[model samples]
Target: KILVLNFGSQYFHLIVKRLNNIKIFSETKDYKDIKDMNIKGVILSGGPYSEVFEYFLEKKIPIFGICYGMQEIAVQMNYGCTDVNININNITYCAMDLYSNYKLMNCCLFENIKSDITTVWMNHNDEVTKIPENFYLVSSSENCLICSIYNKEYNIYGVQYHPEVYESLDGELMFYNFAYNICKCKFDPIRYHELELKNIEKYKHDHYVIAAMSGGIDSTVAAAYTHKIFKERFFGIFIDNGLLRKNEAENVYTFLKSTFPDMNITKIDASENFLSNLQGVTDPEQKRKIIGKLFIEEFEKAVNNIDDINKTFLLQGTLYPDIIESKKFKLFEPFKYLFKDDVKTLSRELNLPEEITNRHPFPGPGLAIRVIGEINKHKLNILREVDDIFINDLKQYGLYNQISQAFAVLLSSKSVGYDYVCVLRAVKTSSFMTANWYQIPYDILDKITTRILSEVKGVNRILYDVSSKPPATIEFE
Candidate 1:
């Protein structure tokens, strides 16, 4: 198994996802959490530098460093730091561009790469000024001279650009070369459900599992799997916070009931409770915290109504991306190690409906967070109408499945003649850590904009969000 050392990079889990794509199992751990483990290759994730480098270097393991990880290697191992002739200064804190493609030099990492001028995704504020002593330059991009470096003797490899993201094109091949060729790691198919079931089985004796069903892919899969194991003991609850998409509560309840016929499930309308507490709350974090706190309180209230509250275990469809992004529970989060895509795969294997399995991720705070500012019925109604129109239009244009997450945000700011301003957001990202805005066709955008202005009341001046994740997040709040 490959061990991915977490350096706080948002894309750290993506490295694990990429390795899993190649039929190799991998795990993410901080340096402190790491102990004696059978690790074949070590991947230093792209984030701030850590002090665990010497531990792996002494073990003589194949180490692959990315971005900041690469910078750390050069700073630690370079012997000519004091030499005036050699410029060993590693990182430049100067301003740099984000999400640009760059030319790469050929190396073992590109052994199977076919492109003559390969373009990989680059997102870094710092660049390596010079190569470290003993290590030779493997590649160089337009802005960064030492894009990649290698130390054959120690089996250490470093790359400036991120290879785990989809924008890298042949990034998977780079990981494949590192895992198979350099580290000699073997491919192993993961039995996802089997492992999850085994983990779920531990609670069968005394625990009654209660799953928080958001009706999204992650929660559905987690709840479904837990119900399969515990059956009658497992309870699934969906709380309508009144901030969800139009008809979301009814539609999701129907889907869950039809899909999992025998699963014990119920829907509770707690919208009034949530909305009441959110009154006059304009801060994003405040809205999020209130919604989160109320969710647990409502769930506890539901559990008390059903069975023994003390014996019940709260289950959430929390994915690896969620863990890496917000950064948990026992509470029981089955998909904590799995990615969103992995959960979808499990959903398919469980024979879930295509619509439910392919649904885009919805924020836990629901539309409360998407409403941008103060909560009110008028604002929510307008936002819901706008969101429904936008989503349906995407489906009508056959663009729903193409984009990762798409939603409409009702801005707090008002226009000259309009009651509210709505912003449309759509991004394509394999890992939620980093994202690129999806470029919808002008005709489609125009169609959606026209429909929103005509149908949705109190909404005017539709705006399309063109900013990526780094500069701006997907959601307005």
Candidate 2:
């Protein structure tokens, strides 16, 4: 897996997000952790420093630097990119034919790029006029000289433009090449399914595997796969955390029991217990670990009497992006990418085996986390009823599939923030673990917000999180 060293670029998450989308995996770590990291390749994310001045050279991994990464790498190599001082200011977006025969357009990385693919987004005030002795240019345009560079073996590379960012140029091409061709990884949806299927076949056995099913995407998908692989041995455990939307637990119970009639599903009420134990706790991560550990204890109590089952596996609905963002980028977006040492600590504290220890951060806590305030019956009910209206509105309007996770946030401040102050944080991203708030049509936002505020008790105002993760975190609280 490629190890991404996030120097400080806000768009650093994009690199990991793209890699996850393409099925290639990478992880992020502090530059200090370089020696400890088993990194095969390195991607120096764009930052605000000058790499040419030896900014992030401690690590010896073959570096693929972008933007500030490139600048710093150049300077680090002793090139000391010129200030240019020439540009009083005349930079603007324009399509440029950087390669000859226009044939470069059809080449591997740039393949299938629009004939007039817009040139890179110009942000640098200086240029790499002086070449570092060993480095050579890959491609460049008028304003910037070393737009791209290559080393002796062509292993280490850099691009003045961000491949992970949204550019008029072929942004993904560079990432695709770097991930697949350079890093030599083949992690895609197909491969992900393959790995899961293989794990199911290899690991699912006479041992007990407890899968969580909630009728949502993750759990549903997980249950389907488990049923496909484990058959009768597969046991689905649906714990009602009381944080779920209106009758969500009952609905899930009915769906899972009826959906897979023959499959053994044991629905347990851990909500009252969960809320009681987790109350007065507002720190999101702390709440998750507490909930997770308690869940294991409860499960252990339940299975205490089960015959001789050698292995006890806890199954969750964590997808690829969850693993990638938390592992590679270390950039945990609020409410989306939440994972780390603490979770592992709790896992060990709970005495879960190694297999259960590795988890992908899930979409939500059955809407509990989505609900800003306490997880009470009234709050869950309001969130549930309102969320149903919100989602159903989107579905009826044929916009549900267009988004990754679209739901209502139950705001806490009652009178001050106004009555119906439900906020909509519907975002669109290939990776749910890292997403940008979608630019849903204003009317669509209005419709959904209106429905929620009206249907949800105490909700009177609607707010949309137009903010992307870079400038702001995902969740409101």
Strongest candidate by TM-score: 1
Name model 1 segments beyond 4 Å from true.
7-10, 22-41, 47-50, 79-119, 123-129, 139-145, 167-170, 180-189, 198-207, 309-311, 325-330
Count: clashes, candidate 1? 0
Write one digit per residue (lDDT tens) for candidate 1, span 388-426: 999998998999998999999989899965488999999
Best by lDDT: 1
Q: State the TM-score for model 2.
A: 0.70
RMSD of 2: 9.4
Q: Taking the tens digit of each residue's C-alpha lDDT, what string does model 2 give over 1-477?
A: 777776766666677666665666556654344456556567877665542223224343467878777776677676222221111122233224333222111123443454423355544555676666576555655566466776644466777766675552466776777667665664343345445557557765555566656555445555655576777777777677676666667876876666577788887787778888876777677777877788777666666544445464656656434554455111111112222322344346534334323322334455657767665666667667777787778878877766656777777767554563567777765323246778887787777776665556676676777877545666654
Stretches of candidate 2 off by over 4 Å are: 1-3, 8-41, 48-62, 79-131, 141-145, 153-155, 165-205, 283-286, 305-307, 325-362, 366-368, 373-375, 416-420, 430-434, 442-456
C-alpha root-mean-square deviation, each candidate: 7.3, 9.4
What TM-score does each of the candidates earn? 0.83, 0.70
lDDT of each: 0.77, 0.59
Steric clash pairs (candidate 1): none
TM-score result, candidate 1: 0.83
